[PDB]
Amino acid sequence: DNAMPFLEGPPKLDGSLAGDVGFDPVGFSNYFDIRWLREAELKHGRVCMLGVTGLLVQEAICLPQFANGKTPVDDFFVVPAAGLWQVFFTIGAVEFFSNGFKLTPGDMFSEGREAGDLGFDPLGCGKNPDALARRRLVEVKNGRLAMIAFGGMLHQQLLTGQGTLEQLANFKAIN
Amino acid sequence: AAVGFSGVPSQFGRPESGVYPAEPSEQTFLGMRGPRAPGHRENFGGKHTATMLAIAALLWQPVSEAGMYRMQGDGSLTKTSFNEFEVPGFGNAKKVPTIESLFPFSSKGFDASPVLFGKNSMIVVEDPRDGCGAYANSGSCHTFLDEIGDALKA
Amino acid sequence: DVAGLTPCGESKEFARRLDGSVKKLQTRLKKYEAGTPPALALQKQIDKTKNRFDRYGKAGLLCGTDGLPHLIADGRWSHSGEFVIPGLFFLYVAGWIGWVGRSYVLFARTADKPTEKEIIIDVPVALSFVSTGFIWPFSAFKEFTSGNLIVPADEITVSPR
Amino acid sequence: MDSNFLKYLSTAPVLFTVWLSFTASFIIEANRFFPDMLYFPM
Amino acid sequence: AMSDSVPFLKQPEALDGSMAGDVGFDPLGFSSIGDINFLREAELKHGRIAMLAAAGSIAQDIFTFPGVSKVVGTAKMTGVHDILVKQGAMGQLLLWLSFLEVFGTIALLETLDGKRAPGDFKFDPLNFSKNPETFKRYQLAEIKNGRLAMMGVGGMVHGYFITGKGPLELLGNF
Amino acid sequence: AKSKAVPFLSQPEALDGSMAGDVGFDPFGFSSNFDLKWLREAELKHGRICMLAATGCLVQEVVHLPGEAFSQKMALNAWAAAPRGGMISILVAIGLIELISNRFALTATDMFANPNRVPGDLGFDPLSLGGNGANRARMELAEITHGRAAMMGFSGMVHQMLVSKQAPIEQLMHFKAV
Amino acid sequence: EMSEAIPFLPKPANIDASMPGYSGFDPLGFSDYYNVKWMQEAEIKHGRICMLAALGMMFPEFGTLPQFSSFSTNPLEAFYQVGPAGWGQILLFIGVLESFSYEKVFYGDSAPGDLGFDPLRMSSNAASAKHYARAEVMNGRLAMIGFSGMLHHAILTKQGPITQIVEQNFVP
Amino acid sequence: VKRGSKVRILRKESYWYQDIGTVATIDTSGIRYPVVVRFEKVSYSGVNTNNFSLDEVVEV
Amino acid sequence: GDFLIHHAIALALHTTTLILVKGALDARGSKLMPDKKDFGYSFPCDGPGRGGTCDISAWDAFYLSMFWMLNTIG
């Protein structure tokens, strides 16, 4: 079916990709390559899944090497700067090596590579095709859900100044 | 042979162009009629322009009310500028450019709102008729009709 | 300030020039009755002298030891209105004038008898040309880059060397 | 307007005199209403 | 070839009778200037917003939600607007109505292309108009009630500007 | 053979009722010495500027932007009281609108070089309100009549503001004879 | 055939799409008079110098070399605080860099901008080479505009770009 | 060169050197300068035509 | 005054240079007289023909430039 019944189905969304319900009202797929859009969507969603898990874990668990802030967003501002640069450059090395040093929309998919498939499947998990399709669908939906969830958790922790589970209990309202 | 202000360069001995494109009838909402590349009015016609204007007006609403809103003990909110947002890891540049750098409403004393007229930036409307009438006024109201009437009645 | 000169608004000899001019006009004013048209004309001249000296003293002009404003023309922006900006105004007008004249010459070659156009101006066409001069730098530069302003040396007459 | 009279009016000396008087009138009225402009005011 | 509503005026050429509420009423020829699809979308949007505003004025006269009386006090009708601009309610209202109106803009431009009826968002989650004739009856009723509520809400807010009573309070006090 | 507007003069040549607002009114023979396309483009430009200008001279009294600098009801005071950088931005933007809207053909020798370029047709129809054929001639007639009325009205308002030192509406409400 | 940057003008004759930073933009017709390959080499060099300059107008506000830690964060003061010896060494290094450019431009027939500095071989992949070839000219033009802006703003404000932003000193 | 053609003059001493004239007559007899060329600009002596050899005229 | 008199001096030097350089470079021939080198450095004229040729030699350019040299040293 179509997500928006009062508009026609976007012609570049053919339903082959997992998660396609026909939702492109602005028409982003009419201008940009769909492989770049899928790589960006999966990367944003994966970063948000790790961010949701980190925001839930850094509220309660703090390694003794670091010194926890009152909220997981303030936890960024108490880390040494060299450590943040270390994480940033390690992520840059991963981004360089996982893409074959091909980091731009003009050469990322020049060798016919699949969007979001960087060949990282260590623990088996990828032999059944019928399970591969369903796990693709689960990955894209949980990625979008973790995008919206991470946006909510970060903005409400910035607003209230307390953590997420610290806000689920003793819940206050704007007054 | 050469009419004044004719605007034909060959009539004035001016270097001509030769190539004159035909004028298409396709129209864009915020653009102009004229010769364009093939594919141009189909990607960037009225639909695209209206969609981008809608998206810009939508995104204006968080941008106009830009700031760090912090809850206090009584549940009230204190809004403070992004200019005090400090970063740990760019050396001696603790203060950094933010979204309020691109949209500095408070620098000009402009009370921005999500529809861009604020409480302290309201459009000022005042009635110029001063609470009197068109004719037969006795007071601080001498209209043009009263001047005409006094000119006849003298 | 610049070059050891003093601003005119604090120079005592500038004030001495103003006072000398005012007394020189006032001694002429003394010989006429109040209300007579020469008296009004002289008082208007006094008013213009006072207004001119007041305006010159508040403009940041530099005065020498003579008592007259001295212009600075080394390119500094603090006196950029003394030579640079009026000159550009001339540069606006003069580049206009030659261009429209050049345009008329290029028109005049295309007529049946050019010399009659040279002595008897085609007034609508000339008014069109003098209207065209408002964008003269860009038009002249495009005329230059398209090879329509500069002609090669092999098409120009020269004397035997 | 007779076309021969207009063509005589379009001659170089008449148009020269009229244009230079017109320019002089611009300079004269500019200096009458805005006198003593030694400088471009800042 | 004459207007049915105004018998001494011609039938407007952009009007045909297909749309609900068409009685040939366009004396000033506004449909000759604008597109009839844009005009019908504007009429439906003005009417639906005015129905919601009329029903809101009636119900806010009738009763109030829990807790609104503390923040607002004895301020009613358009007088709450500025207060609820200082509070966060109307910023949320504008944010979500702008989010809806982005897709409304895309739908209006799609209608101006000509693949979609004006005001047809296909929003019938209760499936009221199964057979086409009841669909026509609700279309006529919707456009008539929308125009009636446009006039009603105009009267209500200008009567509030005159007396400061409210549409039911003005009925209950001369 | 005679002009309709001025019945004691002969009909001016090149005027044949084709353009909107053509009543044969050209006593000084401007169309006999200059081309009608440039004259029509200039007339429409002066008229449109005066439409915006008359609407501004009436609206600015009733409605102002917030701020002290925009609180002058009389428009000749609002010319000076408005911030200078904003008006220089207005000048530059008008220059850019002239530059791109005429498609780099700005003079009396290159505007209308394209045979498809029509006097007053810059291609400006943002809401496409001209998509109707039999309305078109009446629309151009209404536009030129509004422009002419606005030119005469805006001239009268500016010089009456000069005489009276009063904004127009309150000058009509607080009238003082000369 | 019409220009793609200015759709109502004809396409300029002496620029073609094979040049990396082509957009069909020559309203003044510079390519019609001057040597196009010279103009390409000059654009590339102006853009590269402005890339280094746009990074270096901003970078000392983040941090300075320990020997230059006492130097001002305003670039127009730190230009003067450097002695003639350091600027002479910088000029000598720039001259060493320009000797290769002199030889290539006045005596060679290489591609525009090609001084033979490709140690990482990042232009080996054809699509990657095309993307980098266009992107160098784009970021060079952007840095030309940005460095022009930063220099005249530093003239007006006597502080660096980040410093001028965070104090919000936007009016002269 | 032929009748009616526009030609440029390569005679160094000529008033119309590197200027354009129109060929008025080409004489067929054994004349040293058989090409009569008429010019739109008059010389210092007021003449506007001159005879040239074949090598002193080049077609434009 | 020093500014004005040095720019007047520059005017006089440039004008004397104009006369002298124009005399030296047109000494071999001009459009009015392309065979001037056949007539030597000094001769009165080339007659009233071709519009008139008074003071056409380079010696005459010396003669005209002497007054400007006297003006410049003055």
Ligand code: CLA
């Ligand atoms: C080759 C492997 C390697 C080695 C030897 C180190 C060594 C170090 N790391 Mg480290 N790191 C690595 C890989 C490595 N890292 C990777 C792959 C990651 C990402 C998962 C990290 C993430 C990381 C974080 C998040 C932090 C460190 C920190 C540290 C420092 C701890 C001691 C300290 O604080 O005193 C040194 C104290 C100083 C003030 C000196 C400044 C730090 C120097 C300049 C860093 C030098 C690191 C060195 C170049 C190796 C980096 C490898 C690179 C690929 C990341 C030490 C220099 C901590 C740190 O630097 O705290 C300050 C810290 O917070 N690292």
Ligand code: CLA
């Ligand atoms: C169409 C106008 C025009 C143009 C564009 C030029 C262009 C030029 N002249 Mg020339 N000139 C002209 C008219 C013109 N001339 C006339 C009428 C005279 C006789 C007085 C001269 C006498 C003259 C001399 C003696 C010299 C030049 C020189 C020059 C060159 C340098 C610029 C200069 O010194 O200007 C200065 C111009 C003048 C002093 C005279 C200008 C006279 C008026 C103001 C211009 C005519 C405007 C015209 C009436 C407009 C009518 C058009 C209208 C119908 C639309 C340049 C090639 C100089 C040179 O060789 O430099 C390389 C030089 O030494 N010219």
Ligand code: CLA
């Ligand atoms: C000839 C046109 C014109 C000009 C030169 C001015 C000039 C001015 N107006 Mg103004 N104004 C105009 C028309 C004009 N107005 C019209 C038509 C309206 C009614 C909507 C207004 C309403 C208005 C208000 C409410 C205020 C001013 C104010 C001002 C002053 C400050 C500038 C400012 O903030 O602009 C503000 C300008 C606007 C709010 C609207 C301008 C709309 C113009 C006409 C643009 C539309 C056409 C545009 C060129 C696009 C066409 C392109 C096409 C040709 C291709 C300044 C003296 C302010 C002031 O000083 O108060 C006294 C102020 O508060 N104006």
Ligand code: KC2
């Ligand atoms: C992420 C990219 C992007 C954004 C965010 C964005 C936003 C907005 C907004 C937002 C408020 C408006 C109002 C607006 C309007 C117009 N845009 Mg759009 N635009 C983007 C991309 C492009 C490109 C690549 C082109 C283009 C164009 C036009 C034209 C054409 C006029 C005409 O054709 O006459 C108009 C009117 C085409 C053009 O001609 O640009 C000169 C063109 O090539 N746009 N655009």
Ligand SMILES: CC1=C(C#C/C(C)=C/C=C/C(C)=C/C=C/C=C(C)/C=C/C=C(\C)C#CC2=C(C)C[C@@H](O)CC2(C)C)C(C)(C)C[C@H](O)C1
């Ligand atoms: C369609 C959609 C849904 C829907 C939902 C929608 C919201 C259903 C509701 C539609 C409602 C909002 C209709 C409201 C109409 C207002 C009437 C015409 C006006 C009164 C104004 C006049 C008489 C007056 C006034 C007067 C004057 C001026 C001032 C006063 O002093 C006095 C007075 C008051 C007499 C549903 C759930 C149905 C399901 C469907 O599947 C999908």
Ligand SMILES: CC1=C(C#C/C(C)=C/C=C/C(C)=C/C=C/C=C(C)/C=C/C=C(\C)C#CC2=C(C)C[C@@H](O)CC2(C)C)C(C)(C)C[C@H](O)C1
């Ligand atoms: C083209 C079209 C566009 C449209 C558009 C534009 C914006 C059209 C709207 C235009 C406005 C600007 C027309 C202005 C008229 C002003 C004059 C008539 C007032 C004259 C009063 C004078 C005569 C009188 C006066 C008097 C003076 C003398 C003395 C005083 O004591 C009194 C008084 C003041 C009474 C849109 C945007 C829709 C898009 C579409 O796709 C295409």
Ligand SMILES: CC1=C(C#C\C(C)=C/C=C/C(C)=C/C=C/C=C(C)/C=C/C=C(\C)C#CC2=C(C)C[C@@H](O)CC2(C)C)C(C)(C)C[C@H](O)C1
């Ligand atoms: C050669 C290549 C490699 C190399 C690498 C080298 C190091 C290449 C480095 C290239 C670097 C220098 C690129 C830098 C670009 C910066 C530009 C785009 C920006 C200016 C910003 C503007 C927009 C602005 C600003 C604005 C100013 C005006 C005003 C403010 O109010 C606002 C704001 C701040 C927005 C190596 C050596 C590895 C080898 C390899 O084999 C090949």
Ligand SMILES: CC1=C(C#C/C(C)=C/C=C/C(C)=C/C=C/C=C(C)/C=C/C=C(C)/C=C/C2=C(C)CCCC2(C)C)C(C)(C)C[C@H](O)C1
């Ligand atoms: C929120 C807010 C505010 C506000 C506001 C609001 C909510 C404003 C709302 C205004 C509205 C809804 C006005 C409606 C006007 C209707 C008219 C004139 C109808 C005329 C009909 C006629 C002439 C004829 C009808 C006819 C009849 C009789 C029968 C035949 C047909 C026809 C000929 C058509 C403010 C401004 C106070 C500011 C405050 O800080 C915040």
Ligand code: SF4
């Ligand atoms: S008047 Fe002239 S041409 Fe005649 S003889 Fe004397 S110098 Fe020669």
